[model samples]
Target chain A: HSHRQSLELVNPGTVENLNKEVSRDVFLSQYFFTGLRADLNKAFSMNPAFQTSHTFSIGSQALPKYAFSALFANDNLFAQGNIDNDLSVSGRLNYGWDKKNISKVNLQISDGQPTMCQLEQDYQASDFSVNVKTLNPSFSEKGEFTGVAVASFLQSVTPQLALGLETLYSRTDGSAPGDAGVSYLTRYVSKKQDWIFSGQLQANGALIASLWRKVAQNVEAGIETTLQAGMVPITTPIGIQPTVEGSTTIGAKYEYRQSVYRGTLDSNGKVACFLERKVLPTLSVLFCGEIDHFKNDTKIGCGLQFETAGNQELLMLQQGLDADGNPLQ
Target chain B: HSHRQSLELVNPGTVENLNKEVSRDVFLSQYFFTGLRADLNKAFSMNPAFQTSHTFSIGSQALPKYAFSALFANDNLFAQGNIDNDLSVSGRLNYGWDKKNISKVNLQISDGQPTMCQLEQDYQASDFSVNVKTLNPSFSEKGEFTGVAVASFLQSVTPQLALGLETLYSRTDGSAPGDAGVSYLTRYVSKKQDWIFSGQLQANGALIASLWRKVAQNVEAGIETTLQAGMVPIIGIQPTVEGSTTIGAKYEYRQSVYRGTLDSNGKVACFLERKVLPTLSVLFCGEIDHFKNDTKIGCGLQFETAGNQELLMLQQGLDADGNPLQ
Candidate 1:
């Protein structure tokens, strides 16, 4: 068992707006500004065999363009033997931002100014069992303080298969964007090929957005393939949207494929994938490329790297080398 | 300008390590564990014109057969126009578990279960100016709270180049760890390829560890590379360590190599290569790998994937079958 904690403080005068635009345009325009920020976290062991951890984070951002916005968040985790469980709670308050403009446009509100309001409460939890070797009985709840409620439940049937059900209740306050609805999700993993497959069904709401809600009911499916070597993967997703008010306006589409590659390789073609190292005596390389047929676009690129050497000869050689120096062994 | 601040209460008990025993027969056992590690960071701006930020963090860790260790740190950054500046402070405390046992082992004198202690403090500052195009002047002070002090100075010659000098003074404190020494470092970056290159030199007690004394001096150099496209990057870094030391019996030789890589091709490919069609799509494949020579080992291997259609077909079939499953 290992534990760690931290405390931090900063005066408004010390904070710097490193963003190019912020530094040159905003900071210079305002001429003067000031504010503060802080954070905290904690955990405890109930017994030698069981432990519980909780975290709480809160902060505020202030500027002349708007008033102050306060943020709050909390997370709780419990562990016993090979099983682990967790629950999270969070809330936010935006004071000075113009809520009318936001309310008029109905844009998704993040913790930003120009929007003033207090969020109700949101929560999520999951349970893990050593005997089952999986996380099961996952639950989530979210809603506006005005009384609307959205909830979801998930259960694992096998080590590689799981199912989920979700429901939402509209608020009486009339702010709720849509009527009640239900959704379902199923996921399965293939042990033979390290492939993951998932599908989802949503009812009573527009599934895709274009000029307007395209489908009243939506069905979507996606798959991911794992690689044998290197930190890269491929994913493909496709879905169908049936017009909410018109049967002739069915919308079907396929999402572009995506892949990721990360980590390093040694002179002998060995890979060391991690955050930091003292000094790499060997060279490492990474390349990424993508092709999207639907949009008629293609992208490809690569990166090469090598570590510093603690020797005079190496230093002289590196200094004399150009930007296009050979990257390979 | 956009800004944020937060406050939190961290319980002390959370940092305790979980009991994990390596092997019953081993005199010393290693445990695998990680727990609630919490820290705080906050910043603010004086105005939209000039912004400032500060961050401080404190955390504690409990080790097996050892008591508890705590760390505290703080940093302040101020930026105006293209100029950026910063100052930072940090401290650490380690409380030993069995003082008497440590004393009997000749590690430290036992003052009736007294705690073995190690403390550190440091201050650093840097200034950047547009007139220099990309130049900065910086300095730092490091040492045990009550003992010796190490000071260094650095000047940036270009946006990606710097030259620096350093000196260390070992006080006569009984616990001082090394002799006096001086060092220099030169670093530069290549604009076209975005490569970082650096060189360093040190003399005298620079290599010593353990009891206060001069060890040896050595020279080192290295390079790092990074490529950015949109939000993703292809990065690689390599560094080497070589030096001679006389801290042990006769002599010792130290040499090592470290490397790293991160390539996010999926997002890059999705945004750059792949195109979404009303019906079908295509994309390129990529991979990421890692390794270490000194450890004589392969650390990781994961490759980028391109084609995946099973899920698409299944969904299409399900849609064709209708709600009741034709």
Candidate 2:
């Protein structure tokens, strides 16, 4: 434990937050939505980070009717649960043993589907980190182990470069043969941390590389290229032929005092845009649009999101006012 | 004109405003929109009703890119003009001869269309009204007048009922044939003016009937039904059938107004205008086609301003001392 604590002096960042700049800052793949969706997020406390969110959406093929989620996070513990209209429940819990060690568990119970559980451990040292996890592990009648297991390690090669590799093995049942593979990953950050690059060579014969840059104080840009190996069917009554397919996407984001706009274009004849404007202190309007030139198709969507506080003081703060109903400067 | 002025001691309302209550109070067809729209209406003078309005709209097929309109109204004269992005201009001028007689002229000019002009005269007396109008009147090579003429008359037969009729004659050119027709109209009002009914038998073999009622101090409701004679391929092709029926209501609150409508054509529509500030309002409109399973919504903003301090104060709902009033 003392050695682990000492190693924390030069600990590298976790792998989970890798590429966060590209996904969260420059691309809207995580925030884009369709149909008439509404999210009412309420915060009950700040000291312990307690909050709840209710999502309602209709006329959307990808979203469910409704969902409720609650989150509680603190220095040493974190917990969250989500439930949808179909009664599909999912939960996650994390407990920190110390500054350098943590344990995590994830549970999912979907309606009319098999239940899944994953147990994981994280170890962080001054210059390296390791993660081990197992999904739905069980022993067969003859004491044979089955399920999926993964182990990975990331170590800082230099001040600006990090290298990692992941190993995975899965056995569906006692009678099935086990499959195993290894994948390589790398991340590079600029000296000033204004630009970043990440690459992953997956075991499934796919390669992904992305670059993110902070162009200005209120502007960000990113580009990603994905290449995969696939089999093309042939009509000659023979076997299929291996082929490589790839696509590249470039996107940029802009931020204003009261609004945000993002636009993207891809190699496959697709263009998309997303805009969010804060109409009120606690209310925002969202618009998303996509055009597929190759498919001759178009989609447009709009939504509203509102935030309310659980206490009077927080409500007043959210409204940009004070307890005396005076405007804040 | 002297005799008409002397006969105005017991004047009745004008025929042009026969259905103003229903059309303005309980219907929202005039206010519905389907895209981003903004209107800035500025008033320069209150006594003469001098005002100008600018409208900007996008993504709306029914509305133009931009439009500017101005109006001036006084005791004896009224004028208005509207121009759109394509330089299409339309104007109207009204000159009152007296309290009982008024002359009006309307002119319209478009980019790639024929220009039009209309001349009209209105004579309102104590218990009756007569209106005569002609559209695009001109003298052909034969020195014969070629235009469309319309004349209508409305008379108060009782304390609560009015009856009227209109005659129309149209001749496109000297070589073309002329057409003429007549239509009847009626309006009935309750003793307390809380309810009203209007009906029109059109010259085109169509009928329109409407009823409007004030449900409460801040609520109003109205219903309208139309019928027309048309041909049906399955039958003998000469039957009069019901066209459409619609019911609508309007509600007014202290700072907001709402209107809703339901029609027999399987559509529901609603509009809401909320005053976010004294001089600013937000507008929302939504329509759902139940039969087609489609929905459309729109949002807009409106702002009102004045030129002078007094006018500004009036627009802000404040008193002379800059204090709120009851």
Candidate 3:
């Protein structure tokens, strides 16, 4: 399901100033900033002895100003079966959307037979203060899209280490202007421990930002750890970010996007930890803390998790007993 | 997707009793058996933004006699999606038939939102000792079917637990020599441990065989433990079984089936220990035992297991992993 909302900033004075006083201004002084987003999902399963099952979901959000926004969401399920041998299959899909003057979409799919896909998009109105206005609008399309496909081969690698190779393709078609790029990425993960390491290399026609160019390389590693009575979880990562940028003196230069990189590193050669904890059945706490060059910075956040049921529900369906109950037949 | 099969068996006298009478005479007897089976299934998913996603499956099996059987199985998948939202739906169908004189059908549905529906059927030919024959075949027509619905009311109740309830309904049309039956079941569960309870009752024109008529009640509980040597894990279940059965016996004077009760109280238990050595990643030793009380005597057996994967694979399936790495 997706949700979105936005407000039109219409001040008579501002509109008049833009048309008369700033008519020749290099950048537009007054313009509508709109945000839109959505989440989409789909799934399927096949089993000869049993039945085939499927599910789908969609959600969206929109926001035009800092305080104005709207949201929407929906879901569905279906299944089919036959009599003969006892083989079965199943699958699921979900999606969401959001709009603020910008629009975004998230889509996901999972199937029993070994297929999964996730896609995310972030489209924001360009503002001259940031190069996003010039760089983002320069693209053929006014909107941006980012997506990943998780094939069966990638899922077979390792539950904890997922090595997925997808063609990172993006386009700025419409009102948004941007360059399209493709990248290959590999990720190592341990869900129970909230640890992940990811690396990627992208080749593009133009730099996403004036400071970055045609080729980019990124490496990141982080760990999530629990602390403070399991009330919070912190995540920290250290990685190299290389980008190509135009230099007035050198023509073009390969620069490192350190400031944009997340997480803190310590001089003692220790990495910061990612932490997470469930405060309530449906609520969780998250935090990340680290010391960089002997300077400490901590980020704290909280999130709400809403699920129809938890692992307990699945346990009941599979076997019909609990940790406190007797054995099952 | 669905498959069907049928088989017939004709028995020729395979045994002759030798008793010498002054006049030599020989008697011959023959028996005939026949069976037919079928399976069917359907599934689908829907969302506000996507088209209906669905799958289907069907299969059947038939066995006329000892060593005579036929089988078939198949599966299919289908899905649809929209271009603008990337919202799509898909489903699969599967079916299989075997020669064990058994027939079954299964169905399941799930949505990315976590809701689900599941249904299944399993039928087997009764043992071939009774003198009476089933007047009407044991078969469900296209119009007669049973099913269950499941919702993601709970993905999991706890980090290690879950529970679900299912409503079931069935109809039988046949002059069976035994009583027809219906049952309802609910389940509670932990990772590998489980507890299940079910109640069933059957009735018919014939004196309901206590073994087949009186409501059958059952409860089973089991626990699983895992030991790891470095990165590998060894797991096994310790189960306990306590249940009773009621059977009808024929009495000469009354010409009625009487209730004969048989109860079993038993437990399947096991223990596994792992040790890590300097050169080796880990070493494992395990023991499993089962003890049951019969009406006449108590039967018991014990098994001991030790070694790595190679040694463990010698047996049918390692009780430890339920099966080998495969």
| Distance from true location, Cα of A102 in model 3, Å | 26
- Model 2: CAPRI class: incorrect
Better of 1 and 2 by lDDT: 2
Chain A TM-scores of all predicted models: 0.28, 0.90, 0.25
Best by DockQ: 2
Query: What's the iRMSD of model 1?
Result: 21.3
Model 3 Cα shift for residue A223 (angstroms): 9.1
Model 2 Cα RMSD, 1 decimal:
8.2
Best-fitting candidate, measured by TM-score? Answer: 2
Docking class of 1: incorrect
| Per-residue accuracy of model 3 over A17-95 as CA lDDT, tens digit each | 1112111111111211111111111111112112221211111122111121112223222112211111222122222
Model 3 lDDT, residue A40, Cα: 18
Tens digits of per-residue lDDT for model 1 on A127-215?
21111011111123444333334555554455465556556555444455536767554545444523333444544432211111112
True contacts kept of each: 0.00, 0.00, 0.00
Residue B55 error, candidate 2, Å: 1.2
Candidate 3 Cα misplacement greater than 4 A, ranges: A1-180, A184-199, A204-271, A277-296, A301-329, B1-326
Ranking by DockQ: 2, 1, 3
Candidate 2: C-alpha lDDT: 0.81
lDDT per model vs. reference: 0.26, 0.81, 0.23
lDDT of 3 by residue, B1-326 (tens): 12211222111110010001000111000100111111111111112211221111111122111111111222222222211111222222222343312222222222344322222222222111111112112235454432222211112223332222222232333222223332211122223423221111211111111111112222111121111112323475443322332211111121111112111222221111111221112111111112421111111111223234434343334355566544
